[PDB]
Amino acid sequence: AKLETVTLGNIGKDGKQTLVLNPRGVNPTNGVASLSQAGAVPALEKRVTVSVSQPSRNRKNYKVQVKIQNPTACTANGSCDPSVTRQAYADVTFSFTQYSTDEERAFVRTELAALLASPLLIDAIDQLNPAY
Amino acid sequence: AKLETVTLGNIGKDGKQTLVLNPRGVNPTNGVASLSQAGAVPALEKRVTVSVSQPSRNRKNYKVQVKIQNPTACTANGSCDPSVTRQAYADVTFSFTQYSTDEERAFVRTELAALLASPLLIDAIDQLNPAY
Amino acid sequence: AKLETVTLGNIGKDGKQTLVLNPRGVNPTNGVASLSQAGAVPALEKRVTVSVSQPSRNRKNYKVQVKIQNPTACTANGSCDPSVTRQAYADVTFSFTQYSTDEERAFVRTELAALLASPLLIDAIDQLNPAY
Amino acid sequence: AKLETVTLGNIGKDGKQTLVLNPRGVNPTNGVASLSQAGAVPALEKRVTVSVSQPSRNRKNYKVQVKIQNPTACTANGSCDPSVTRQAYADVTFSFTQYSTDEERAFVRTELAALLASPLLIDAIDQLNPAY
């Protein structure tokens, strides 16, 4: 639709922290939009991308794709400032076909957003226990 | 039998410290069960595995195998980012044959558990003196 | 003869410090006895070896050999504990022949122990000045 | 002539510091004499060499050569002692011929010792400005 300052509420292990994002333009090379947290150093900030795609003569299917990464700085050595030690990636891809209606496309998104809060799935991610 | 919270008492040089473990599922790829200490970071915790095996057309013998490792963290560089300095393993394998009764299988376990507390053996491990 | 706790007195630049050693068995692979200082970590302790040898069909001479090493440990920043950074070794080999009597063998040892306290030799070692 | 404790006065940016040196023998391998500052660790001390040479059947010219180096050491970071980080070498070579008298040989030394205190030369070394 149109980029804006996407705000977010009730995020965390408790669900009390918030997070605000700012738009940072659309890359016209490959259609990838971007959002970012208002940080200072451009390698210590959270970012979110999103990029729809279109069927060519090769692929013949739509493909929505969302990426999230979260660097965490630490390890100040000496008196120079902080540098990145770890990463935490994410990925979501959709593969809707051509003649699909919109109830199906909403149903997939709805059940994914509901299934990311089931007790099995937070047992799987937050504790790294395999489903058994 | 069935996994549960295996508790342990009188462990140490003095025999006063305790240790509690929690079950973390059975890997169905190779039958290896697992236990673990309730830690936060998944590379700074003690773990114990155990895996019985069965005779195939190649091996023709049962084989019980137990592994123990104990990493030791250094938090010199800051609590948020500790690095494992060094490790310390263990290994126990049994090789009982097919027609063995159960008194023999209990006798081997009993004499191993008794021989790991003889003065010769704690002279060997705790001081690294060769038996002479 | 027989290993025991070899004690030592009047050692140092002033000759006031002492040092005590403990026996740690005889390696039967190559006849090398060992002594050690009662330390905790097995890479931060002083050690002394001694190993007589016998004439084979190839060498035809006795060969007494004594080795001494003294590791130095300091702890660098952001590290939980001591490491080893410099060592100072030593070596003494004797090559007595077959028909030698015992007065000669005592005379060599006596003049070596006397010559390691002459002013020329402590000028050579403790100051690294070449003999000129 | 003969080695002795060469003392020095009025050295520095202000010309108030002093420096004393001690003889440390003549290397008979290549005629290179040596002086040194009375330090403890043999890699953290200033040293000065000097070595005359003689005409062979190949070179046919005398060659006096003087070398100076000054290591500098930064202080402890943990407790482990002083290390060497940078060096500052120097070099002076002379190439007097065979039939040269002594007034010429004194004149070269005199004008070099006078020219190392001209304002152009201390503008060149102490500020690293090229002569322009």
């Epitope: 100040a76 | - | 702890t75 | 407790s79």
Partner: antibody, heavy 116, light 104 residues
Amino acid sequence: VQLQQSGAELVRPGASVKLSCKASGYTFTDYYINWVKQRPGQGLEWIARIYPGSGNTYYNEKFKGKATLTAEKSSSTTYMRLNSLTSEDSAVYFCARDDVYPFYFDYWGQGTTLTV
Amino acid sequence: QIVLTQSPAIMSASPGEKVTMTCRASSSVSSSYLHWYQQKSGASPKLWIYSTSNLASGVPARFSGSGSGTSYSLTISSVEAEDAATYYCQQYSGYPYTFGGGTK
């Protein structure tokens, strides 16, 4: 999780003192421990810092030869020693625990005054 | 090596106003290293703002620090009674730490 220091005291000048604050409620050798001087009429400043699991002391250059401090691992305390006492130092002395990424001080203890 | 200046030293209290104190360094103290503490009239201090942006646990809703560079500030909106005692600030750059002068 807390830590308490000591009571009030006074010494006559020229002497030397001991101070201590004992920790409780966490594993002792895993966090740094500092000391902090607050002269009462003025702003408050920092003096020394040591890690108990090793021996590593870094100190302020104003008070470089004034204070020495050690740490005993068994009783889980930390001793600090002054010398050549005078009427220049008469203040409350704090000790606080931190770890390291954003260097700030977690947990302050109640202060120990000192008079000369 | 680094010197702080907190430009007010005394302030007045009225329960509806909007008050703000600032601080200024003598060099480029980096962000995310500097903090704010409030000390009561007769007790040990405690944390108020860490890394100049977010808040501690027992902090109420309305105090918010800001600033980028070498001149930072804390802004109080809707002050009430039993709030203002002292406000120090301190940062760590290079090596010896240094605290603020103080304000109230």
